[PDB]
Every structure is written in structure tokens, then in C-alpha cells.
Amino acid sequence: NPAENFRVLVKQKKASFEEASNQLINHIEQFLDTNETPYFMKSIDCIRAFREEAIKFSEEQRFNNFLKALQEKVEIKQLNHFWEIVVQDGITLITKEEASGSSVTAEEAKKFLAPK
């Protein structure tokens, strides 16, 4: 339900809306004491919605650095439930693509998940 809330919030006043970013950050992170897979897939769906929202107009790099921050914050925490679920469900499109340039080299650097 809140996914639609911050989906329509960004397109109703045309602001940066750090409140929506904080809400989705709170939603995605809270999985240490909860093992509910439905919660995790709802969280990845809403963060993907915010990914495409950021892709839309001018804040691609904003969600790029947010995704990197999410990556190190899930990497520092060593738990049996980690970003593997994001990777297995992010197989379609999670890599950034702005224009001819760093997008392709990011594709090679991320597709294999490690430099080979």
C-alpha cells in the first residue's frame, strides 16, 4: 500500500521528496528479525519502482549512489540472508544505463558479478 503512496507522492508536487527515499530505505532494511520472503519481494518491488522513478527525469545518479550505499550496508552485515535474493531477482535490469559511455563498462563489470 505505501508503495503507491510514495509512487504518487513524487509525481504530485515535483520535489526531491527525501521522505519517500527515507520510507523506502526503512522498508528495505528491516529484515534482520523478520524472515518473511513476501516482505523481501515487496521491498525489492518498491525499490525497483523508485529505481525507475529515478531513471525517469534527472536523478539516475541519485539512485545509483543509493544502490551502492545499499550494497555496502548489506555487505558489512554478515548474515545468512543477504543481497543474494536481490541478485537472483535483479537478473533482469538493475545495472545503470544513462547513455553511450560508462553504462556498457558497468554492464561488463556487473553482469559477471566479479571482474574476470
Side-chain angles (χ1 to χ4, degrees), residues 1-15 17 19-61 63-116:
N1 309 145
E4 287 290 329
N5 190 7
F6 64 78
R7 263 185 284 195
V8 74
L9 172 74
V10 296
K11 60 173 178 286
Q12 83 196 26
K13 297 199 171 172
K14 277 73 69 177
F17 288 121
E19 42 271 37
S21 306
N22 292 315
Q23 197 167 7
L24 61 95
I25 280 296
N26 190 5
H27 196 290
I28 184 68
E29 57 89 20
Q30 188 53 50
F31 194 75
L32 59 91
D33 201 19
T34 299
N35 287 330
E36 283 167 329
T37 303
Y39 179 86
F40 214 83
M41 52 76 78
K42 184 176 179 180
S43 69
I44 67 183
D45 197 359
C46 66
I47 67 169
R48 260 65 145 186
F50 196 69
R51 169 88 188 104
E52 67 96 26
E53 286 183 9
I55 284 173
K56 275 209 287 288
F57 63 98
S58 88
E59 63 185 2
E60 290 202 271
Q61 93 289 345
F63 202 87
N64 291 330
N65 56 77
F66 299 149
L67 192 141
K68 267 72 176 177
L70 287 150
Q71 207 51 49
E72 73 253 8
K73 89 153 169 179
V74 72
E75 276 167 295
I76 55 170
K77 300 295 113 177
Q78 321 298 333
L79 296 151
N80 49 5
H81 54 78
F82 53 94
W83 61 88
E84 57 182 359
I85 296 97
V86 176
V87 173
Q88 65 183 177
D89 295 332
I91 56 171
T92 61
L93 291 174
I94 49 175
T95 315
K96 62 182 182 51
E97 185 278 299
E98 194 171 83
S100 280
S102 78
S103 159
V104 293
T105 185
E107 291 292 329
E108 290 89 6
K110 162 80 185 167
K111 201 153 169 104
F112 311 135
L113 272 297
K116 192 88 76 175

